[PDB]
Every structure is written in C-alpha cells, then in structure tokens.
Amino acid sequence: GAMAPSYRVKRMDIAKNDEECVVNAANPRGLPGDGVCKAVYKKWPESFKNSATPVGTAKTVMCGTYPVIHAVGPNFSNYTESEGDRELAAAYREVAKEVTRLGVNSVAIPLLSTGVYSGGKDRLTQSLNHLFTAMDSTDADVVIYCRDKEWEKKISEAIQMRT
Ligand SMILES: Cc1[nH][nH]c(=O)c1CCO
Numbered sequence: 001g002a003m004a005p006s007y008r009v010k011r012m013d014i015a016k017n018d019e020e021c022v023v024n025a026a027n028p029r030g031l032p033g034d035g036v037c038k039a040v041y042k043k044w045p046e047s048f049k050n051s052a053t054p055v056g057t058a059k060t061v062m063c064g065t066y067p068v069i070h071a072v073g074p075n076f077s078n079y080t081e082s083e084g085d086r087e088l089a090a091a092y093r094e095v096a097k098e099v100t101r102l103g104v105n106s107v108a109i110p111l112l113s114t115g116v117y118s119g120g121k122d123r124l125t126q127s128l129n130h131l132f133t134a135m136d137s138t139d140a141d142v143v144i145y146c147r148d149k150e151w152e153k154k155i156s157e158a159i160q161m162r163t
C-alpha cells in the first residue's frame with residue numbers, strides 16, 4: 001500500500017498517467033470505443049485481447065506487465081436512473097477488488113459514465129461519490145483524470161472537503 005493513501009485529480013490525458021495501473025472506461029464488447037476508451041486503445045491496444053465483460057463488472061488484461069482494468073459503467077441512455085445508479089456503484093466496487101488483488105501502490109481512474117454514457121446529464125457528483133465509496137477502503141494512491149477545467153475544480157474541492 002501507499003505510506004499515506006491519498007486522492008489527487010489531474011486535468012490531462014489518462015494515457016500519460018504516472019501510476020502503476022490504469023482503469024479504462026470500457027464498453028461491454030471490448031471495442032476501441034470513444035473518449036477515454038479510444039485513448040486507452042491507442043496507448044495499450046494489447047490489453048483489448050478478451051477484454052469484453054458485462055455492465056457493472058471489471059476485467060483486468062496486462063499490456064506487457066502494465067495492468068489495464070476494463071471497468072464497464074452503464075450507458076444512462078439505456079438504463080433507468082435507478083438501475084444505472086446500481087450498476088455504476090457495482091463497476092467501482094469491482095475496480096476496488098482488482099486494485100487490491102493486483103497489489104499496486106497507485107491507480108489512474110476516470111469518472112465512469114460521464115461523457116458519452118451520461119445520457120446528457122452532469123454526473124460528476126454521482127460518479128465521484130461511487131468512486132469514493134469503493135476506493136475508500138483501499139490503500140492505493142488514487143489519481144483521478146478529467147479533461148474539463150470546471151470539473152477539475154469541483155473534483156479538487158470534493159477531495160479537499162473530506163480531508
Ligand atoms: C464538461 C463535462 N465533462 N464531463 C462531462 O460529462 C461533462 C458534461 C456534463 O454534462
């Protein structure tokens with residue numbers, strides 16, 4: 001584990017992370033996809049061998065020795081708010097199990113079911129609070145990656161507010 005487990009946020013491409021493993025915002029079919037998934041596909045295409053996995057689950061595939069944790073959040077266009085909320089919490093619980101299993105000291109994580117799977121709604125708080133619920137009991141350093149300047153501020157505020 002990390003000597004003093006922390007949460008941090010950075011505004012940049014998760015493909016350039018400085019962590020021991022990465023969480024992909026995957027689709028269920030292990031396709032290259034869009035947004036974070038497409039960036040992950042360019043950087044670690046070898047990790048898409050047999051990466052298909054159901055909604056609400058995570059599946060780790062190594063790129064060399066670098067673990068890519070494919071986490072499938074729900075697409076809120078298809079799920080009800082209630083069922084989507086349940087599957088989004090579940091995906092993050094499965095990420096925490098894999099991060100623990102791998103024994104990493106740090107993980108790079110995007111906010112699942114924001115962007116294309118958000119169903120046109122702002123889900124920063126929903127997604128971040130499910131991330132915290134799952135990762136709080138882990139001792140890895142967690143680095144959250146985002147692209148929007150206002151989201152960076154709001155994620156930073158949410159981290160600092162619980163300190
Ligand atoms: C600005 C931003 N970053 N990620 C997102 O999902 C959005 C739109 C929210 O409605």
Ligand SMILES: [Cl-]
Pocket residue numbers: 012013016
């Ligand atoms: Cl960048």
Ligand SMILES: [Cl-]
Pocket residue numbers: 146147148151
């Ligand atoms: Cl963002």
